[PDB]
RNA sequence: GCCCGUCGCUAGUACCGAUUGAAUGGCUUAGUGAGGCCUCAGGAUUUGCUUAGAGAAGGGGGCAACUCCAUCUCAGAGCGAAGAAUCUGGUCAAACUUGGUCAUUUAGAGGAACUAAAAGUCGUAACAAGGUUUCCGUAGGUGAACCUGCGGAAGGAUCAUUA
RNA sequence: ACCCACUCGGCACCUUACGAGAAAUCAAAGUCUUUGGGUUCUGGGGGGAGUAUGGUCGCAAGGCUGAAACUUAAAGGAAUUG
RNA sequence: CGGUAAUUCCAGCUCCAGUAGCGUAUAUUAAAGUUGUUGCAGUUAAAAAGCUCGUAGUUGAACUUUGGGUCUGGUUGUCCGGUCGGUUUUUCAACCGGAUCUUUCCUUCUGGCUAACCUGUACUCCUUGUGGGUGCAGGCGAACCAGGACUUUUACUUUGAAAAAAUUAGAGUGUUCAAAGCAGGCGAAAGCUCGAAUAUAUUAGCAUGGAAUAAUGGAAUAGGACG
RNA sequence: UAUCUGGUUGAUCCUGCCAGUAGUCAUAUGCUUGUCUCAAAGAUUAAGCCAUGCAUGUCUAAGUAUAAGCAAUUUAUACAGUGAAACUGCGAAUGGCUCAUUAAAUCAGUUAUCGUUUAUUUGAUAGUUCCUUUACUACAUGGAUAUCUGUGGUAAUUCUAGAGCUAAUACAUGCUUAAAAUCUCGACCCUUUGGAAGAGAUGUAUUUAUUAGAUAAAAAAUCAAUGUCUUCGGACUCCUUGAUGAUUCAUAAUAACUUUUCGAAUCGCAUGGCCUUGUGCUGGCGAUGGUUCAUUCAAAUUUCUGCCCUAUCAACUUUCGAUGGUAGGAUAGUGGCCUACCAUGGUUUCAACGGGUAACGGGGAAUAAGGGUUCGAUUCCGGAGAGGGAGCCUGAGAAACGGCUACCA
């Protein structure tokens, strides 16, 4: 979500240490480097097939996937390029013995390779220290569509 | 600070303290076993009742499977060995039934007059 | 706070030294070195608890200034050396040479070893990497690197030091059917045949190890090395030899065994 | 000082963290460099773990590269020209990593001189074959070409000079020099 | 018999309360801003290398640019290196100043309570259909209980009048 | 429009209670120490007090919300005989 | 309780309780099912909002794979001790598995090792034999890997790995007994020698089995499933 | 080792409370007190104040010695035995105490650092400093400064100013050093199949680039560049590559820089081996140092989940970073840690925010059927603090306080 313009910024942003040789003439001129993500996680084609930079993603960035590679579904998506994922959970007491609903939400990055909407599940991996909250990272949008294609009622 | 050197109020009182036909029942054992305090009864009840504890942790569980039958027969083996229990009786579910006057007959007090020496207990 | 720390309080001395309760505030913290903190087992402990060479720490001090101890080939004057898992100490007045091998209930043991096989000293990997120069190197878990290593010794596979030299005599693959021999916490110092290696992605290896008696337990893989393959274990290992019996199967033997 | 601390900045919600301890060594970071280009000059200083950590006071020259040759040279600076940051750091004329600036360009002339020897801007036998058998490899992108002849490249400096102490970075090729020049445009 | 209130005396608990109250601390406007660190300079002092002319009694192995030696050694002067106080911006920011503000304390004239009571006045409300049945809600009034409207309830003084 | 029998819905009585219940009584106030169908709410001796305060709501009356300090050995409930 | 016989005040003798201790004060836990999850009350004793709506919460009908066989591992009682108070089978048992076959897949393949004979290539070392194996073209893959493909997701429960030590429970042991402690034990008493356990801690994460329970999900514009 | 009694009544059965009852490595006190083992002990109130003394310093065969010290006697015609003093080294960031803060903070387990520093630790290890190559410091470069010699001050103090000498593992500079291979330069000949005499540069750190760091299998047609062997039809064949779940990783290259780091003008014991018979060239056992890689001690962050009371706190954060982004700046490093520009997020009745706490967290403690409650200042593990609040030097490690600077008290 935002999003599109590639470079707009007062910087022009590339993928740093990553060239695109003006002396060599390939058709791709962009040489798009990617990152295979490993735990059975796999690299989406919007990755590789598309444009953005972005410092901050696991495929195209070096945002190194690791540790608690949690879920939960989607609640905010406003802000750019993050995501807040709603982890809900049950708490044990025992003196009642019996469960609390608790809540957590986890403000989470995209790599913006997925789609993501709100009332959607996704598991998202741990990395690095993004920013100030986010410690974690879209990895896999599970509801894809989730009735996104079909609606719709009259035959 | 080596550690704290551990330590139990061992010998614990009644809760209450008046029971009439106790305090009867406890003077007939320290006239009986020469006991100069309470205290040399509870002594012996606790301690019994410690082993009691454990028969009772141990019998909730099925004798057959481990702890009950190992720890249950060390806690055997000991009081055999102390020789609180008898020889007919060695199935735990015995154990549960020693008595705090079976441990006092056990005691050097009274195993001195038992075999002779003293006369007369105390 | 402010940086490392120095000392090491007898409560919190870690359990496998079986340091004694009370007779001290703390303990012998020991030194930096090639094993962790807790992993190691310093020789305040070995010559004074356990061997009972010297009565007390001056004894040890002294028996270190003067100078036949000799831990792995080197000789060490350090009270307290992180003599870890592995470590051959020799004794050369008495002759008592000792690998450093874990009793099965968990805690270390005196194994008065050889003349003789106490000579290598089997050892971990670790790395497999490359340093400058482009030399590939490994490491052991248990201390050393070595340079030079044949391109097939691979991770978490043991290797043989020639230890006087320090080179490579051989080494032992890590695959299914090889006897290892164990170092993490509850199945500390058991052996087994291995069965199963559970990849795990991020979350710790995982392999699956009958013993002679067959009782399969699982470890993980930093916890575990290997000794060879089965049959023939490399080390000379001590009476009990990693098989781990039950509590009834340990008060039998004792019960049973009354010789006077 | 000027410490990195996560204590303050009150929290993820709003709630104003109450002040745990007081701000620690291992936290800090000092005052910024911001390296001018007058008289070179650097001071060191002690950071963590003992490490010289350079850092560079009006640092004048840096090594300047290429990407189509693969070369740099002890190329001096003229000024900054260009900071996608702030433009705060174009009139102080205060250096730093990723700003666009101005190489000198006679060295990367000479060179250029031995490398093909065909000249930017508008003797012996067996050389004339290896003359003959370099050049017409890289024809340059027209807006270097011009530079070249300007005795003004616009370079990208990708060193951090307050850390490093050398202030070495990176001449614009392509894409990227085709977008800084847009900006300078923009703001000229 | 029980008993309810007004009004009295004797103690104490809290309450409110003018105080432009007071304190302590927490936050906090504006102004100042100690002191270091970085930073712009600044150069007390200390020296190397320059062949820079000595007196020097072999100032390198026998009158002589010593068969001139890190030669006797200061006027050089150039070139450095290190380098104090001092000092230009920053920055961190104690604390003060003079306010503003929350929290907790704490004097407070006065008021208005409430509770114990030895036992006193004034009645005697309720309990018996308690001598106008009690109640509740809610208005008004009184010297106090209380009373009186309205509505309600019986915990009513009635589980009852048939055609 | 009745009679009579049985039925879904409504409003209440009689007897035994073997079931409840402190009992009065209750076919629910039963299926509860043989303790668990689901849910919301309220109470924790009496007073002080539905007061003080602070909200909040009201034209106001007042409401909603709601204290302790202090005080006291009983306050009750149901029934038994007088 | 105490107004001249006060069994309660105050003193002597008795006596009780505890005993090198016992009282007193404040907390606090128990008792308190007087805080109640287990486990309380609410017609009248305190307590059901005047009533209805109502979001969060919490709770929420039933329904999808049941049954039968066929072998095959154990594990204690039995049947004698077959034995030098202990041990090995059968006549038998229940109990817990495992493999399967039942309209039935347990995730599926691209390949590595196809262990094995479903074999039959020469047919026989050989009691008159289907007792027995030197043996390799088609080829049963579960005997393991090592890489795909993509997993409806949870709760729930399992054993496992981890939950520092002391504490806690607890095994061993003559600190004289214990409270404890990690000691100790036996020789020619010239040297040798057992130990220093085990368990718990259940909250979260990690591991693997299980698929009832409970939720969740899939094909109804089939844009569905396969080839 | 599941236990109840007295009390409202004329008496009854309840509701109910009070009262008892037992126990507290739970405080206090009141009596009383012979012994044995063991043994807490200024936390609670004032994280209030502190006389005095002490609690951190350290030298070996082995860094620096003409103490005008002690030795003293059968190694010193530069030194060698002991050694005050001092510089250098290292340590003083450990332990100890305490609990004021502090309520998602700390802390516990759980991960992670592919996100970092790490003196010490024990493992590893640098022919390339030279810069044209017919006469150059290398068998050893420089002057300082201390302790000392005195010259002194002061009312005080672990205050030290001047001169004279005097060192170093202190501080600066600074030599050798190949062979090969690879990359930039080059006297011509002979019309192609083109091919070379010879000159310069190339350690390690550093900096950015740029390339390699591969890997799902077999077989072609021929278009541009056109190479090897031609047994002059044409063949082309044997063509490199670690680790992880995962990288811009390890590591290797091309290009350079750089107020050009490092690459021993260091030290104690041992006195061997060849004679080209010089005092030649040679060589043992150690110490410290020194490079990045390792490891250890750790270190910072960080993942998940978990706190006591309060709605008489329902909104809070966002001017003065709140939430996200792009870029920088800083840091050892990640990051709203800081700065610019931009977007409007972020949390909340599954109690945000606020307040309270006679709250340091955890391990644990007492109680003790089961479920629990209350306590945990306190012997272990974390965290904080050193009258407050700041700021910093040195150092691997300090925002140290038995360091310093300041302001308040
Ligand atoms: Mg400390
Ligand atoms: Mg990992
Ligand atoms: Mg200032
Ligand atoms: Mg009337
Ligand atoms: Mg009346
Ligand atoms: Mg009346
Ligand atoms: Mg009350
Ligand atoms: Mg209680
Ligand atoms: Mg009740
Ligand atoms: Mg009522
Ligand atoms: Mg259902
Ligand atoms: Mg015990
Ligand atoms: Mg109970
Ligand atoms: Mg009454
Ligand atoms: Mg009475
Ligand atoms: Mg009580
Ligand atoms: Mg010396
Ligand atoms: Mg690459
Ligand atoms: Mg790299
Ligand atoms: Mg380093
Ligand atoms: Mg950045
Ligand atoms: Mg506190
Ligand atoms: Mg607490
Ligand atoms: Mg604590
Ligand atoms: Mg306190
Ligand atoms: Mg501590
Ligand atoms: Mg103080
Ligand atoms: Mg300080
Ligand atoms: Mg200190
Ligand atoms: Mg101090």
Known sequence: ?155 | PRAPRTYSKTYSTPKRPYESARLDAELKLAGEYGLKNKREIYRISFQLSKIRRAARDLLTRDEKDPKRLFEGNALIRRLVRIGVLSEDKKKLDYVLALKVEDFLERRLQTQVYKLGLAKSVH | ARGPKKHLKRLAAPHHWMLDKLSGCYAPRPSAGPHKLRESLPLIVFLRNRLKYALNGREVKAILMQRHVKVDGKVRTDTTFPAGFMDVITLEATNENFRLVYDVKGRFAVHRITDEEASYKLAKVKKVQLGKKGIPYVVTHDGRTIRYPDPNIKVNDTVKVDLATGTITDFIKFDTGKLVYVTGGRNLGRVGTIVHRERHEGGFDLVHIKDSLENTFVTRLNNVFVIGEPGRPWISLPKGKGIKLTISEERDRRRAQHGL | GISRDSRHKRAATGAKRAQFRKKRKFELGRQAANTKIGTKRIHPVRTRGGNQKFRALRIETGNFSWASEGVARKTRITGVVYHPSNNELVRTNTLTKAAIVQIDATPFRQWYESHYGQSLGKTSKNTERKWAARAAEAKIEHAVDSQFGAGRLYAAISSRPGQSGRCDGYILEGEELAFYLRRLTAKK
């Open chain 1, 1 to 155: 979500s935002t999003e599109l313009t590639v470079q707009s910024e007062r910087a022009f942003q590339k993928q740093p240490h990553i060239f695109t040789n003006p002396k060599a003439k390939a058709n791709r001129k962009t040489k798009r480097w990617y990152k295979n993500v490993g735990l059975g996680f796999k690299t989406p084609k919007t990755a590789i097939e598309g444009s953005y930079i972005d410092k901050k993603c696991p495929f195209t960035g070096l945002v190194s996937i690791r540790g608690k590679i949690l879920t939960g579904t989607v609640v905010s998506t406003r802000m750019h390029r993050t995501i807040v994922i709603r982890r809900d959970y049950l708490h044990y007491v025992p003196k009642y013995n019996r469960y609390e609903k608790r809540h957590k939400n986890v403000p989470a990055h995209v790599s913006p390779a997925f789609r993501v909407q709100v009332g959607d599940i996704v598991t998202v991996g741990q990395c690095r220290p993004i920013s100030k909250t986010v410690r974690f990272n879209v990895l896999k949008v599970a509801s894809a569509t989730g009735k996104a294609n079909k609606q719709f009622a009259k035959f």
